[PDB]
Amino acid sequence: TVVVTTILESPYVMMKKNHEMLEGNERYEGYCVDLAAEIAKHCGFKYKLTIVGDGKYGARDADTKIWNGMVGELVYGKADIAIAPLTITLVREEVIDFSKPFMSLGISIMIKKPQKSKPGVFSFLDPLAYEIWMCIVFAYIGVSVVLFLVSRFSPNEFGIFNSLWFSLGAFMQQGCDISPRSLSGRIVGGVWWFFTLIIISSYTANLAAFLTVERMVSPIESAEDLSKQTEIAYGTLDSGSTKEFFRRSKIAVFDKMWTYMRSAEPSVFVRTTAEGVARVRKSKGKYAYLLESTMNEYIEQRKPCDTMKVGGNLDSKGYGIATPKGSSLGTPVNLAVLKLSEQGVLDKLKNKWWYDKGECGAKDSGSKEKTSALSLSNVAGVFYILVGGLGLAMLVALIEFCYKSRAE
């Protein structure tokens, strides 16, 4: 019945727009506002919902030593109970006598949902790997040589130049008017015909698999090589917990991650957990907003269905009710939470608030497939080889005619 020093957020506490009609406790609502009710069962004490106008979660500030926002309301005697998202740091423990954690989060990654990649020019030879398309060309020449050697030193229109046209005549299945005539020239023409039947029916078959079941990749998964393979913008939140864990980095794989944020520009940090979603949401190229875990699985769920959590829990930090260093209400507070946790009423509120909104994920990705026609950009490399093949052909037309003109 004193001060709720919470902050306007995602589903823990926010002002819902029904306060434009309603009043009372229903001015500010959410997960932890329900937690205010079942902590009032044991302590007896009511609420006073005061969203921090200074709310910049923070700690004691750098070299001014003024406590910021929530602890700017909590520590100075302006508040005593702190039912809210509040992360227990050991330097915060130096300032605040806490309670035992609700849940625990980790430092997470909000990458944007994998939208389909742009196929390159040479994406037409995706369904057969770059070892086979080099094994074919050397088996093309490797068979076209053996037609030559067999049909020459034996009893002849098979030169070299007419034997590179039979083998190319058979690989594009366009057939032949040459048609070798020995027994030892028909075995080369035979087993090469069985070669082209399997490879073309493996190209068509695999391309019918890429265009039906399209598994996708999130290339910045598993945050150790997010740090190592530096490709994308290491975005994150600002003043609060998530920078101060990485400021005190002693695990070197997180330190070299922090140095890249230390050498970042222009978004070393920005602000606003809502906006940090939006900076992923609209840039979509490289921004990789590094927020706390329990906020990340909410935004991912809500209903844009456009972000996704790669990696998991780069730290383990806890949400506990903060009390300003001695704060006599503490023993009613923490024993309540224990009786909320051990009975599972806090877990019951976990079951409630993270299944409220429209459910998403692979849940929405059921039988919803409509698959599109190929655009030109999937086979556009073949039109470049085709026209570029003609530019080679009209070039040799001059070279052949000049070698008949300079023959004279």
């Binding site: 655009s375 030109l376 003609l390 009209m394």
Partner: protein, 135 residues
């Protein structure tokens, strides 16, 4: 053969000049199917790109700047810009050298420059369409 050359210069000449290469109808939807009105609808060209619905103002700009998806396409149209220009180069070379031939190899070498313009324009239309389906 003169007339197909005469008609060839003007038709691509109108096309490379005008501002009606590509349309756009970026809108919204509502339930009861309640689609949209116009919300954002730009027609576009190769050198002057003129918005029509989002602001109604014809900012037919020599593309270097603004006046989000729009200029992004115009950076990709920039990647496909020179190929109708090369096809217009080799056409007029094939045009004049054909008339000189009427007034020998002079007619035949012009027929090379018609086909080199045509094969330039196929890669012209492909890379223009490959830029759009990219965006």
């Amino acid at each position: 053969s003169s007339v197909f050359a005469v008609c060839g210069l003007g038709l691509l000449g109108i096309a490379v000049s005008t501002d009606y290469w590509l349309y756009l109808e970026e809108g919204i939807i509502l339930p009861q199917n309640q689609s949209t009105e116009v919300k954002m609808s730009l027609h576009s060209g190769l050198w002057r790109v003129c918005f029509l619905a989002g602001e109604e103002r014809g900012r037919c700009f020599t593309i270097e700047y603004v006046m989000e998806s729009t200029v992004n396409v115009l950076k990709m149209i920039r990647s496909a810009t020179p190929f109708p220009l090369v096809s217009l180069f080799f056409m007029f070379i094939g045009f004049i050298l054909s008339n000189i031939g009427h007034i020998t190899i002079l007619a035949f070498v012009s027929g090379i420059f018609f086909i080199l313009s045509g094969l330039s324009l196929v890669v012209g239309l492909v890379l223009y369409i490959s830029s759009i389906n990219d965006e």
